[PDB]
Structures are given as structure tokens and as C-alpha cells.
Enzyme design. Sequence first.
Site, short mmCIF file in Angstrom:
data_model
loop_
_atom_site.label_atom_id
_atom_site.label_comp_id
_atom_site.label_asym_id
_atom_site.label_seq_id
_atom_site.Cartn_x
_atom_site.Cartn_y
_atom_site.Cartn_z
N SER A 34 1.31 -3.36 4.14
CA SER A 34 1.63 -4.54 4.35
C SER A 34 1.05 -5.48 3.57
CB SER A 34 1.21 -4.61 5.90
OG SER A 34 -0.34 -4.87 5.74
N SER B 269 0.88 -1.12 0.08
CA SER B 269 0.07 0.07 0.04
C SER B 269 0.79 1.23 0.09
CB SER B 269 -1.02 -0.12 1.20
OG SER B 269 -1.93 -0.98 0.99
N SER C 124 -5.64 3.91 4.42
CA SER C 124 -5.32 2.86 3.55
C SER C 124 -6.44 2.20 3.19
CB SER C 124 -4.31 1.88 4.25
OG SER C 124 -3.30 1.28 3.15
N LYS D 15 -0.15 3.65 -2.60
CA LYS D 15 -1.19 4.49 -2.71
C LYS D 15 -0.93 5.95 -2.82
CE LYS D 15 -4.11 1.20 -0.73
NZ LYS D 15 -4.67 0.54 0.43
#
Length: 260
Positions: free
Chosen positions: A209, A42, A102, A45
Amino acid sequence: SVQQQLEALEKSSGGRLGVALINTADNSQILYRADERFAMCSTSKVMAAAAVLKQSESDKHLLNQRVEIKKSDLVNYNPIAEKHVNGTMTLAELGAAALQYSDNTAMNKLIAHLGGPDKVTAFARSLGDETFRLDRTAPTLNTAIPGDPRDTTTPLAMAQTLKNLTLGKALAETQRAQLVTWLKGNTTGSASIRAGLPKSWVVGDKTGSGDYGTTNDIAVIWPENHAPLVLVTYFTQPEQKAENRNDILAAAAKIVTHGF
Ligand SMILES: *C(=O)[C@@H](NC(=O)/C(=N\OC)c1csc(N)n1)[C@H]1N=C(C(=O)O)C(=C)CS1
């Protein structure tokens, strides 16, 4: 030395650690496996959100554009989008949700708006990042298979790009400031880089993660009496179902910021 301390940490942890610190006072660097590829998970992002901010430099209406959220849009982790099913969110709101929580639905909506993961990669290239690649959407970009080049970058490339996005020349000022606001308001990083730093320092970060115990954080750090630092800590393990290890990222952060 710092290098010896990171080697020991990596050895004891049973994985592979990648660190890149840039001290913007003199552009000095602390590097450890910084030219090796790691799955971003992530942390990618940040690039999808930044690509939409870049669009907004030339399109004043864009960030207020509404996007419908339907039940079918939901994937595996969507703490903010699930609160808006059958409603709308603006692109700005999706940016915020992707970065601060997230949210995986928020990520996929940003990617869909841009026209696919290849468009995020092209944005990175436009910033001089020749390393970054985004290949898949969420959540499959978190598979983090050893040796798989999909959805990877290097610690040094990501540190350089993050510096350029948040402190440098990548975005116009209004957009730069918006990205920084979003990173500062992250809710997911308390046990990662932040936990290895003085409590009074101001941090903006994005975690990620995935499988293979892959545990990542990228951060901009504002000390109270010194120039900012940019820090990327990437960590991955050899077994698919390995536990994630945010504590290793905190430890690495403590090691590379010590003394100072
Ligand atoms: C980004 O990394 C997103 N990662 C995942 O969704 C992973 N599974 O995807 C197949 C995942 C999350 S924990 C783990 N062992 N795997 C996550 N964004 C993260 C993040 O750390 O920033 C979490 C907040 C949720 S989802």
C-alpha cells in the site's frame, strides 16, 4: 459478465483497477487493465527476496550470513527489525521479515546486499520479465504518483513472474519451496485477496500500500480440489491522500474466482 462486474466495481470505487488471474489448469486468463502500469509498492519485496534466494542456489552459506541492525537503519515501518537493534539478523530472517511483515528495513538491507535497486531489476529481466522496474528503496518506492513509471509493473507481467517464481522454472526447488513458505506465512493480507476466497483455500500473498490510496495484493492460491491460481489485484486513486481500499481487492477476488 466478469468484465462488466469489474468495470462497475472500478467505476463505483472512483479509481483504477488492474486484475490478472492465471488458471494453471489450462493457462487461461482473466484480465482487466492488465497491460497498464501500476505502482507496485511493497509487492516489490517479493522480487528482492527472490533475488537473494537465486544467489543462494550457488552459495550455500549465504542465507545464514548475519547482518547488523543499527538504529540508523530503521525507517518508517520496521516491526521486526526494531526488535533486533544492536543485534544481527540473517539474510533468511530479513527475507522472512520483508515478506511476512512487510518490514521496510528488511527490504532495504536486502537491496543493499544485492547492490542497489537496479540489481533487482536485472534479476527480473533474467526471468524474462521485461516490464518490472525497481528504481528506489523503501519507503520512497511507495509514492505511487499517477503516471510516474518508477517502481512499476503491469498486472499481467507480475502474474506471470509470480507463477514462474512459485510454481515454475525461476528457482531451484529448495528455493522455490522457501519462497512459497514465506508467502503462505504472510500476516498482512487477511482483508485483501484472502477475504474474497473460500476460507479453506490455502493462500500465499504479498500486500502493498502507498500514497494515492494505492492498494495491492499478489497471491498464489491452492484450491482443495483444483490446480493453483495466480491472482494479482492492483488499485490506485486520483487523490494523493485517498484512503487505502483492501475491500476492493477482496471484492475483485470474489468476482474473478466465482462459480469455480
Ligand atoms: C509497502 O507498501 C510499504 N508501504 C508503505 O510503507 C507506505 N508508506 O510508504 C511511504 C504505506 C503503507 S500504508 C499506506 N497508506 N502507505 C508497507 N508495507 C505495507 C503493506 O501493505 O504490505 C504495510 C504493512 C506497512 S508498510
